[PDB]
Amino acid sequence: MIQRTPKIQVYSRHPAENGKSNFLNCYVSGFHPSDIEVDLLKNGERIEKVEHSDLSFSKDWSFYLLYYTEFTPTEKDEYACRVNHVTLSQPKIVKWDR
Amino acid sequence: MRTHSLRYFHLGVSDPIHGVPEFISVGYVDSHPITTYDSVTRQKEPRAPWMAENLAPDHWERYTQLLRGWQQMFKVELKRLQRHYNHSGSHTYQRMIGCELLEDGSTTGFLQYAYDGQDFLIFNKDTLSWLAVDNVAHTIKQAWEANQHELLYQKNWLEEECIAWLKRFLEYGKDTLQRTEPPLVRVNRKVTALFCKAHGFYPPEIYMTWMKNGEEIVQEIDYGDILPSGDGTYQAWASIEPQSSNLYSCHVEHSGVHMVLQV
Amino acid sequence: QTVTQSQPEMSVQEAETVTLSCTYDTSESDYYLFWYKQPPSRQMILVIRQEAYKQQNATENRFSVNFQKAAKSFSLKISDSQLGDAAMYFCAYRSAVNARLMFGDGTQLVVKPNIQNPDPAVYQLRDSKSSDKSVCLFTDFDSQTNVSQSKDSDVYITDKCVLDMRSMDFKSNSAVAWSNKSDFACANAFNNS
Amino acid sequence: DIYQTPRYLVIGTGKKITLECSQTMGHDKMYWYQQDPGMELHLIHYSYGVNSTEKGDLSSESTVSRIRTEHFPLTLESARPSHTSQYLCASSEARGLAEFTDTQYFGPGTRLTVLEDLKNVFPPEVAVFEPSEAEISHTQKATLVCLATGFYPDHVELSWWVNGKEVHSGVCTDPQPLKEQPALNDSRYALSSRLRVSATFWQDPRNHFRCQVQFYGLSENDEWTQDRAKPVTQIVSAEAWGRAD
């Protein structure tokens, strides 16, 4: 299998304003095969309650989902998305900016 | 009245781990999932309130059987592909069928297969022939190109039934599909760099740029992708970076509306 | 999801054209239409095939169809009928997405031969064994004649039956009757008919 | 093309029945319909290929298996009277799509009859009635007539043998039989056939005529406690020799 590595994008539904409740989004896409593991990270720990869209198909034979979780950003708090795929020999952890 | 599209995708996976279903198939109108089948449920089901409400239990029953059929066929084709390629682990086979209705009323149609996420077989409805990547595909195309009725059914569905169904679904989901939600466009700052950011819009197709003191276009423009915000809307951004000797401005276009912003 | 063939019985002269009639009901647009014939063998035999995505009406030599899509009408046209054509004919619809071939109720087609010189006659035949039991044969009657079945219970009248002696190039309608009762002859066995 | 065994089967209530259907056209899609006297054909089982077995419009206590491409057998565990029907297997050529773009070809079918009491089954009595001088003199032709009587159920196949060869030209067999006691429902049956030849040909005494009736009846593991001989599968035949006279 000539596989494709997952592209990970992490962002919030509504523009971040500390104190305002929101949704944290992780967009994993462009990956082949289909089997994929995803966790969202607060301060480096697993968020535990997390929803995910049903696996979706692109025309170029890659897949995509959206992992998401209802959160309130505290000025102190750091957030990331960590994925693992056969294509990755180590977990890829992409931090949330802003 | 904008370009819309109907697509049904099939995916098969040999020797899948506990979770992965051996077969999944999914229908889509412009990225809105409308239908779903898998190997555990062995049931075609609506993935939208408006599909569900508007189709009698027969449609789902009838198409469930048809998809039970495809399940079976993919299981088999997979083993034959292995036998021919001398394969060994979990592999994927995939098929995508669908049509596009352009704003100008003309149409497109598409049918394609893939082994391990690489183009295997591409259908051509004007010449009633497959094109194949290697002899394995060629061999299985030969048999297929023998059956003339199958060749023709495809051309028809693609050129006729697919569109009829699109038109129905568009209507059926008008409130969500033919809707227009305009964006929030804003400018933020950050070597000094400025970002035109837009959010909470629909449909996702959006165009953004920067215009040098309104005159020309900045050549050096980093474009954020267009991403789904969570709620049915999409968000996207565009960035550029000398005391600003010429004051700049953002130009955006969504659903027919050319929008502009100064700083 | 439904087929109707209203003509339960139908008739034709040898070398004549006949039209068998059939309508279907559906809402599907992508579909398949067939005729099949079931001789007394009870074997279903394909006669012709028409796909809803085709205007030109199918033709298999002597057989052809009138496909009026908008009328949802699908008539089988048999030219130059032959005795062999005799059978039950069935109209059938199949969706492109379901397997059940939906069948019409069926139209029975009888072929009348061209009796060139009628020579209506009733002959009697006897047992090659006991020579006490006997039968009656009505035959070489014109094809426009009909045979009443017996209203009496203990007398057995068979149906009209076409025979083709290809040896001698000769066709022949025939019908047989029997009974054990003594007050019974050939002369009057077919008189009610 | 496609084969189905048996073509006729009479069996007692509650015994295990296996109707065979086989095909050698390389057809993945296969079907099984059921036609009760009058009622229309009903898809009861179908298959998309090896190890597919799906149900159809009408619901059934039969079962099917598809271990391989050529065979699609149908099994009936506790066989009951209501199962009495004609079962038609079939096969289609679509292979590259799940969709049904093909034409279904049927096999010849199996006339099943399941009976509560096996004492209603009887083999036929065959008798050849020889031609008539009346006819011979009038027409130059001789019509021999066969009469199969007293048989039940209607599992019978009649044949005309001239000089040890089965013949086709010159024959008319009632497409359907008659009830001997039309009054009843379990009424026995009587069928008639006609063989017509030359007067020349019937007058040659070297010429042998045999009317043969094949009857499909009880088999070995079936039970029978009755004076009437067990009405097993058998041929019942009757003959007549040409006569110069």
Author numbering:
A (entry chain B): 0 to 97
B (entry chain A): 0 to 189, 195 to 245, 248 to 269
C (entry chain D): 7 to 199
D (entry chain E): 3 to 247
According to the publication:
To decipher the molecular basis of MC.7.G5 TCR interactions with MR1 R9H, we solved the structure of the MC.7.G5 TCR in complex with refolded MR1 R9H-5-FSA to a resolution of 2.81 Å. The MC.7.G5 TCR bound to the MR1 R9H with a docking angle of 43° and buried a surface area of 1,150 Å2, with the TCRβ chain contributing the most (60%). All six CDRs were involved in binding, with CDR3β dominating the interactions. Despite being refolded in the presence of the drug derivative 5-FSA, the electron density for the ligand was lacking in the MC.7.G5 TCR–MR1 R9H complex structure, indicating that the ligand was either at a very low occupancy or that MR1 R9H was refolded without a ligand. Our crystal structure showed that the long CDR3β loop in the MC.7.G5 TCR reaches deep into the MR1 R9H ligand pocket. When compared to the MR1*01 structures, W69 in MR1 R9H adopted a flipped conformation, as observed previously in the AF-7-MR1 R9H complex structure. CDR3β L99β and A100β interacted with MR1 R9H W69 through van der Waals contacts, and the E101β side chain formed a hydrogen bond with the amine group of the W69 side chain. These interactions with the flipped conformation of W69 formed the basis of higher specificity of the MC.7.G5 TCR toward MR1 R9H. When the MR1 R9H–MC.7.G5 TCR complex was overlayed with the MR1*01 crystal structure, the distance between the CDR3β A100 Cβ atom and the W69 side chain was reduced from 3.82 Å in MR1 R9H to 1.7 Å in the MR1 *01 conformation. This shortened interacting distance would potentially introduce steric clashes between CDR3β and W69 in MR1*01 and may explain the lower affinity of MC.7.G5 TCR for MR1*01.
